[PDB]
Symmetry: none
Subunit: 28 residues, 15 copies
């Protein structure tokens, strides 16, 4: 699994980025 | 699984980006 | 599975982007 | 699993970035 | 698992970055 | 697995309420004698 | 696993309330004689 | 595992409340004779 | 494991309250005769 | 393991409160005759 | 000429509330992207 | 000419409330990206 | 000409409340990115 | 010509409240990145 | 010509309250990165 986040400017993350989710609880 | 997020300007994430979801609960 | 999200300007994510959904609950 | 976060400008993280989630609880 | 955080400018982290999450509770 | 659950139990009895209105003009909000729980958006 | 839970038990009884409104003009908010819990946005 | 929980037990009884409003003009906020818990955003 | 919990037990009884409003003009905040717990944002 | 917990037990009884309002114009904050606990942001 | 005397915008979301869009009480100019 | 006498924007989210967008009580100019 | 007499922006989040976006009581100019 | 007489921005978060974005009571100029 | 008579920015977080972003009572110029 290859994930790319290129943002020429204002690159921000406020949610949930998950390569693989097998279980558990994620709240963003 | 190759995922590309290119944003020339204002690139933001506030939801849920999941490459593979096998279980669990994800709330954005 | 190749996913491309190119946005020349204002690229934002607020929903759910899932390459493969096998189970669980995803609430955007 | 290769994850890239390149941001030419203002690159910030305020949410949840998880390579692999098997269990537990994550709140951003 | 290779995770890259390159930011040519202001690179900051205020959320939760987890290589592998098997258990426990994380609040960002 | 997430589990969301809520709600309330009300037990109201054996009460005497005298409601008298001799001069409420052009009311546009809320006029409540007695409010046990619930949501009021005036 | 996340578990969210709330809510309240109300037991109100044996009360005497006299409500008298002889001059409430152009009311635009909330006028509550008695409020036991709940949410009020006037 | 996270566990969020709240809520409040109310037991209000045996009270006498005389409410008299003879001059409340152009009210735009909250007028509460008595508030036991809850939220008021006037 | 995280565990968040709160809430308050209210037991209010045996009181006499006389509320008299003969001159409250253009109120935009909160006018509370008595407040036991809770949140008030005037 | 983290454990967060709070809340307060209120037991208010046997009081006499005379609230008299004759000259409160253009109020924009809080006018509370008696406050037991809670949060007031005037 | 514009005049707003009273305006209320109440958002009561008892559950999994959210707002992914703009909530503008009075829009006159500029650009709002949400 | 603009005049706003009273304005309220109440956001009561008793659960998992959130705001991923803009909440502007009065917008006149500029750019707001949320 | 702009004149705001009363304005309230109340945010009551009794749970896992959050704000990932802008909350602007009066926007006149500039750029707000959230 | 801008004049604000009263303004309130109340934030009551009785839980896991947080703010990842801007909370501006009056924005006139400049750039705010959050 | 800008004039603010009364302003309040109250942040009541009875729990795990936090602020990862900017809280500006009056923004006129400069750059704020949060």
């Amino acid at each position: 699994q290859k994930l790319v986040f290129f943002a020429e400017x204002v690159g921000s993350n406020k949610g949930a980025i998950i390569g693989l989710m097998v279980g558990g609880v994620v709240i963003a």
